[PDB]
């Protein structure tokens, strides 16, 4: 009654390059499996069994692994396998902070359809809790090496829990039972068979199985460094090694005296080869005694299984964006040092600037005081933003893992996450202008906060998402922070705040328009002189740090009448030389309106979310 | 013949809070064992066999943990706890770019000796490789997420060699058989029964053990949510039931029964507290049926066991320093890209720097230029040495598991720790100053571009050590890229570059001294205004950029004999007006000589890395 699905895997061969030597991992191992039987690996420790199902969940790298794996007699897309399959992985990769039903919670809402309501989701949730016996666990953290939450053995099972919440058609463990005790162990393969006998492919590793354990295993594969020694039923054991020479007694466990044997024919002289050449032998003595794949799989979501075309995810994007945001939102709650931190150094930083600035004046040095806090208060913002880099490289190992089988699509996740970093960059751009715009004195009343804000907020956003755009670059937080922080210093460099635009060379030019500095920093300077006519050097301030020494007030006015004399034009004690405008003109902000300079900054920022987006569709996958 | 030990635990009662109510880890717990011995902990997945063997261990908090813990009658003190035992946890912790041998040979190299030689350190790694059963492999690297290594059988063993190396009088194992195939967790019990029968106790968990492997068992503790419901030999478990009321039939597995009888007690009305209270009983009937510690330790080493006063490291301080360098070391040639992109940031930013700076000149713009040509290369030298924050961050977990047991002083660690970093400092440091100093121009000929190497690198040594003191201070890489970008700021705004040190406020003068920028910037001035005498302003650059216009050569002669009637000096078109000691007095680089700033930043660079050890004496353990 469920739909049928034979898992055809042939001449798998995986060989790796040993740094320039090659070692073959896998050779020519093949074998099949059905829908309602669970196919158990075994072996040694160290003899292939995370290699051969990380060679059929599509795992590791095309053109490295030989051999073809089929469903129902056609070639079992990696399009495909995406769509109809789970993997839980030898060790575990959790989100630490939360507990254990916000954990399968989130496993729920992604992989669950919305035709399945919340609440149905919810009892979901609270059923696999019971069944995998970790109800005492439910409300305490996952937990790391440095945070003690939950044992081993219980995030084990919410390991297990996270892709068994959805019922898969192929269902990749490896050894799910590790770290189990003996009746936990027993309650886990119960939930595996009732899963198979709905209508899925299990393939599972395990290591010491009971008499129990193997009573609900149909197929059994031994492994022996990288060959295949036994394929078939556990009561077909005792009769295979009866003919290979060396019986098993009735009173010993089955599977130790195999290994046992296997072990001790890797140290003889002739090896394994002899038992490898037995089992073809063995397997080819045993054969002697309509629906399309597209159509039987879509048979198969019709009869209940992944909960008519098959959709690639459970769900449309905008609900994949409301899931992930709540588990940013989740991870923030539960460590709020992270952004009370952020909050922290930016309103320190306000604050400082506050009392070394306090209320600048119309003066020579008033002007230079101006320029110096804008290029101070616009390079602190981009260097805060570069503590985004380990947002998305602590995190990246599960979002490989999530997306390897469909649980959001790539794009949901830069969605999402320029989302839930947006309220943060409000909440320091807020902490910043308001200790800064009227305690340093600037101009424009409340349109010119209202544009102080903006730009800051700009700024934080163009900041974080060419941070961001470097973290998917990088594979590594200290490469990351060596190149951020250099190319930080370039965009400061030829911002026009350090030397002039007339004064960077001509083959630097193209790269003192890409700075990211550049733009907000020209946009503040016309919003503070935005008074064409506001005088800042009045003519007797002329003199004020000429390399002439100090000079007294009346002597400024002789040198007032005598440089009248020579110049023609008639300098007063209160004729103004130099402007607001004339200020714009000598740092060289001429060329965009500060609306235009805060429409390029927004634009940066989300050209490098594209751009990081791109760089999850070419990379970010962990491949063999 | 083996010095006896018995280690007697009793009434350990543990309560964690749940983040407010309280939640009782473990209850009441009592047992001993004795040298020569195996105590198996078992019990279901969360019962508290981890937390036991915690509590046991010295690895959770002291007030937090109840009941006595002693050795031979007398308590076990922390202090001898870290000399004579060691732990293998549950989670495998190791660097993942060594290989399997090279791990074993750092930690032989830890734990043995000096009267051991070298080639018998070797012996001792091969042996334990070969009876541990991972020749195979011994080449491979370990591996994490997103390197492929060995597998995860493998690694268990490695962390059961990193602790059996030597050979310890106390040895705790969490789980050590998990994730082990049948026939090498036999192998494993095999090797920790010869260390026990050596004079050893061993305490262990563990979850399915075999037939063959209980018997290697002599005692066993089951535990059902933090309560001992049996403690004897594996012969007395059919005897126990029979007793409680539930016998064991002969063909079905021991500890599979007790593990089923158990958690069928647990969702019971009554819970498992009837068999709590039965197993007090039996411990009751079977009590009816000279050499001080600190001399049978000694008496102990004499005999072999960890290989006469009781030394608590194996080595001398610089024997850890020389074995921790070449860890460091081991770990930078197997990510050259780490050092080398470290290397080609700094070359690159003292390329663009010699093409926008390329041969400053003697004129009031050339000032200008040198003085932020200056204030750029110090402030992306503090900059750079961020990077340097998530180096202890990423050691931190393994640095903590290894001195927890007194594999090396944590004073060994910061010694090491400042050696490795050094000659890439001054690789960096020659990288910079051959790249800036006679393209921009810089003065002195020889003897100048040598204090330039010099300041250079003390820069760089300053602020890798202030990084470094504040990677022990927080937990966290964000955390501390967030303080770390903060403070460097507040540094550069105090430093005497953005604002004079005339116009720092008064509240504000202490943290200007205490900049670490300062000390190397002002040292920079006084080796390029190393010419007091040097004429930078010529008397017709009075009025370079007035605000006036640009002015004809000839009228600005006009000016100069203008400005010569109102002020008595005569300046004509050749007079100098600002010398090399001019500018230092305009800047403010007056207090000190640059060899005593010079002798600050080096300074500032001993005093961080002594906060850094103080931060490693107060904080840095992981307990509970
Ligand atoms: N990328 C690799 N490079 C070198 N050796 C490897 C690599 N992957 C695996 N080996 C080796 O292949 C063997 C089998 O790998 P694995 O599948 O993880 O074993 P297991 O049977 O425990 O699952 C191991 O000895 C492992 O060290
Ligand atoms: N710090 C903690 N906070 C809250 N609950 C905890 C904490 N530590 C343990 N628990 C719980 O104590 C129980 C036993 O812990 P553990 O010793 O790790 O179990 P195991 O028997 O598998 O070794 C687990 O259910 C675990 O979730
Ligand atoms: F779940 Be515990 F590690 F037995
Ligand atoms: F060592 Be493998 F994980 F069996
Ligand atoms: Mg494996
Ligand atoms: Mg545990």
Redesign the pocket.
Known sequence: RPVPFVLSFNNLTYN?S?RSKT?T?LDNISGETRDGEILAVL??????????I?ALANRIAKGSLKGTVTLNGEALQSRMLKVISAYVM?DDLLFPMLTVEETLMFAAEFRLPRSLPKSKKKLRVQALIDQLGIRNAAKTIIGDEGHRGISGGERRRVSIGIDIIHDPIVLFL?EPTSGLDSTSAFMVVKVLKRIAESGSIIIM?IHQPSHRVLSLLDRLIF?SR?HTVFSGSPASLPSFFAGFGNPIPENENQTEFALDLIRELEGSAGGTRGLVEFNKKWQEMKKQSNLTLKEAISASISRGKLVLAVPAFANPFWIEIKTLTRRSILNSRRQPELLGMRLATVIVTGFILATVFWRLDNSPKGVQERLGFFAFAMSTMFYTCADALPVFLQERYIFMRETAYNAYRRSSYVLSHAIVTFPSLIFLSLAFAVTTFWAVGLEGGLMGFLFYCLIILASFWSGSSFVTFLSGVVPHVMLGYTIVVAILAYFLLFSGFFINRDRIPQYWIWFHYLSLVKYPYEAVLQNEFSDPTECFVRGVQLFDNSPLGELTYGMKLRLLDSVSRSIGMRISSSTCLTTGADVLKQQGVTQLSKWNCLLITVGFGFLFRILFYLCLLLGSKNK?
């Open positions: 790796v040993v070692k991992l072996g040694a420790s160290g003899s292939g069994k995370s290699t051969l990380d030898q490896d590793s492994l990288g063999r």
